[PDB]
Design a protein around this ligand. Structure first.
Ligand SMILES: O=C1N[C@@H](Cc2c[nH]c3ccccc23)C(=O)N2CCC[C@@H]12
Ligand SMILES: O=C1N[C@@H](Cc2c[nH]c3ccccc23)C(=O)N2CCC[C@@H]12
Ligand SMILES: CC(C)=CCSP(=O)(O)OP(=O)(O)O
Ligand SMILES: CC(C)=CCSP(=O)(O)OP(=O)(O)O
Ligand SMILES: [Cl-]
Ligand SMILES: [Cl-]
Ligand SMILES: [Cl-]
Ligand SMILES: [Cl-]
Lengths: 429, 429
């Protein structure tokens, strides 16, 4: 795999952000304030990732038209405590913001994570945010080519609560006490060509609470019922057997995601979170208890050990946090995560990808450690320029204390090479 | 004056038009259809005029946000006659469309002429379109820097009908039988820097009908009352004396326009239309009956005679047309026009600029004649490329018969050089 592009871009107001800012009439104060707090970051990310200028303008305009109205009310600041937060605490980011730009620094690709909300999201009128994410994906579908919602509707029927089930949770609040109430999250992959690849994520914990069925059973039955051809069957069964092995438990099945394209050629990812955050546990998961030890699998594990050591990952046993850590309060530990890529290929085991929660760790120190890894795998442009670009996104900030600028970092081994993505703070007040 | 830039651009779908088209969510079918019928033309014009890419995107986005909603209902086509037209017949273009892109081919600058309308414009609810142009200019004012509405409000008070005066015209339709009902028109000059220069035009013929005051008296008293400092006094008086001379009549005072900037440093243009369209009449107007014959004035007149002969202007006596010539019916004669630039300078006479109505003349033949003039004044890039660019704006068209693609051509002598602007059809069904 060729090394990723990385151009420096530290401008407070990138040219494309200015050109659009001077031309847009907003019909909402919220949209206008969201734009100015997040558009500069997105514009820098696209310039540093070396997207074409035409494509930069397409995606910033798309951000303006499609995303801004889906962000709902602009976050409000507490005069006393100084905590900046929205009413709806999104399960997409530990800050609780409905927007996140992630950076695939292996390919120099940018993705827009969005949790579509309204003014009523979280209140008594819409306590689990059931409708708006669907409307968002329907709007995206009509606008963007190749977006097939077939997979979304099938998983939505099976993993999202109905009107009747919602009334039960409203009438009996004690049945679901978790602050993480997002059922559906979204992501748009921004390709270099101009094509946008849309993904949906389903968190069935509310459905699990009402129906009395575990998260594992909800996800597996969902995947199995949707998989008419039986393409995911072998890999799903061996994942179940690994989950069965770990049960006989810190390995928790959590959620899934699906690409929105041709159903017979679409792929599902199964996510689980692990509490024991150490390299011994990682090998066990990465190799399925030693069953998956082919050359590609082992070479990936060896590079994972370097990645782990370079970023100075602190090992420990971490549970799911008590609550959110909003922008303003002190930063923190949480469980690591793994997705398993049900790719429908010939392989017996689904492709694993590790996510480590770095929220709580010094962000400047993490990126310096990441630079060490960039030099290890020979990503010259990225090693030289990424750090200065990451920090440039947060001008008025103390990097000596800031531990919220990167929440998660992901690691996978694809096509004989490291695949790394940073999930970063995407908001400047 | 340096020669104008002109790059070739014949693409059916220019890149910036595509990038935005693939990213915009329209809240109106009308806006969406206007965009696709006019945005390709604007994008080509900006590329051929050699605007920077950042500035292209600013102005296309500005077009989308500010202009599209001001165009009102998309034009409808008669199934039998094939005539495509809007309910409101705008006095800005002989086709009756509320949008026109003009090309200052002397400087390679593009201007957006707009007649802001709504669904109610022309009907019994708003028969003279009084409110929407004001709202448009107020919206533009807040969005765009340097836009001072002081001149607009003063001329609006004096030249636009009040609510009471409107009721009189509604109650008695025979008091104003003219199809040209636009009182306020607008224009945005697109500078190369990114700055937009906004202008307002006031046609006081409805005010003249109700108040019983002539168009001449309405305009002059307006200019004189607004001109507190007395900067326009000398030039206005000598224009009045020329109008007085011509009265003792085919020279008709018609309307005025004003830039929207610092009031004490803003400039007014006085427009009059002439029925006798011949070179002998042009010299008389251009020289104020022989009073203005300084070297700059005479050199300009000599070049005007070449311009006149190159485009093959047919001489004659032409009155104001009986009605509009909408897109679909056969093309035609009409009076020529002159603006007089009350510049507030030391000069005794205001700077004249000629407008010739070329609507009715073969547009391909006119542009070929214009190319001859471009070669005469040494505009090499413009001579080589303009014709192919003009025609590229109308793909599915018979140029053998088409006489509506250019409505007016303007001529002035500025800074020892020819100043030419084409006012062109800006719509593709
Ligand atoms: O903040 C969270 N993020 C997601 C994953 C994610 C990160 N970036 C995303 C972008 C799109 C979809 C999902 C994600 C999640 O599952 N979490 C469980 C614990 C904390 C919480
Ligand atoms: O079609 C017309 N155009 C304007 C001038 C104009 C041309 N392009 C413009 C752009 C902005 C403002 C004014 C204009 C006008 O005064 N006319 C009188 C006779 C026909 C009618
Ligand atoms: C950060 C978390 C938990 C999930 C995001 S998965 P993603 O869609 O960003 O990763 P891919 O593009 O599928 O490799
Ligand atoms: C075509 C007619 C009658 C008027 C337009 S005047 P304009 O504002 O386009 O010309 P300038 O930019 O003032 O020289
Ligand atoms: Cl339902
Ligand atoms: Cl640390
Ligand atoms: Cl009034
Ligand atoms: Cl002819």
């Amino acid at each position: 795999p060729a090394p990723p592009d990385q151009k420096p871009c530290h401008q407070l107001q990138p040219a494309p952000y200015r050109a659009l800012s001077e031309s847009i009439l907003f019909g909402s104060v919220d949209e206008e304030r969201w734009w100015h707090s997040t558009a500069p970051i997105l514009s820098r990310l696209l310039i540093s990732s070396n997207y074409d200028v035409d494509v930069q303008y397409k995606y910033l305009s798309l951000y303006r038209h499609l995303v801004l109205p889906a962000l709902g009310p602009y976050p409000q600041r507490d005069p006393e405590t100084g905590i900046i937060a929205t009413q709806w605490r999104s399960g997409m980011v530990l800050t609780g913001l409905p927007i996140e730009f992630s950076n695939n620094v292996a390919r120099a690709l940018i993705r827009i994570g969005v949790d579509p909300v309204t003014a009523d999201s979280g209140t008594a009128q819409d306590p689990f945010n059931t409708t708006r994410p669907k409307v968002y994906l329907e709007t995206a579908a009509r606008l963007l080519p190749g977006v097939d919602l077939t997979r979304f509707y099938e998983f939505e029927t099976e993993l999202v609560i109905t009107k009747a089930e919602e009334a039960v949770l409203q009438a009996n609040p004690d049945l679901f006490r978790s602050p993480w109430k997002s059922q559906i999250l979204t992501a748009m992959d921004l390709q270099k060509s101009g094509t946008v690849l849309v993904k949906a994520y389903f968190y069935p914990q509310p459905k699990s609470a009402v129906t009395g069925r575990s998260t594992e059973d909800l996800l597996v039955n969902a995947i199995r019922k949707v998989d008419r051809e039986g393409r995911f069957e072998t890999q799903l069964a061996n994942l179940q057997r690994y989950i069965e092995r770990r049960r006989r438990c810190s390995f928790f099945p959590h959620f899934l995601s699906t690409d929105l394209v041709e159903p017979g050629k679409s792929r599902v990812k199964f996510y689980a979170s692990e509490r024991h955050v150490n390299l011994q546990m990682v090998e066990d998961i990465w190799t399925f208890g030693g069953l998956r030890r082919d050359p590609d699998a082992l070479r990936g594990l060896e590079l994972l050990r370097h990645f782990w050591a370079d970023i100075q990952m602190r090992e420990g046993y971490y549970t799911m946090p008590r609550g959110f850590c909003e922008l303003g309060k002190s930063s923190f530990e949480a469980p690591m995560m793994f997705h398993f890529h049900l790719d429908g290929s010939q392989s017996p085991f689904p492709d694993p990808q590790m996510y480590v929660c770095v929220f709580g760790m010094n962000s400047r120190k993490l990126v310096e450690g990441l630079t060490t890894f960039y030099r290890r795998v020979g990503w010259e442009e990225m090693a030289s320029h990424y750090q200065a670009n990451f920090l440039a996104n947060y001008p008025d900030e103390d990097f000596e204390k800031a531990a919220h600028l990167c929440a998660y970092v992901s690691f996978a081994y694809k096509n004989g090479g490291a695949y790394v993505t940073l999930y970063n703070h995407s908001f400047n007040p």
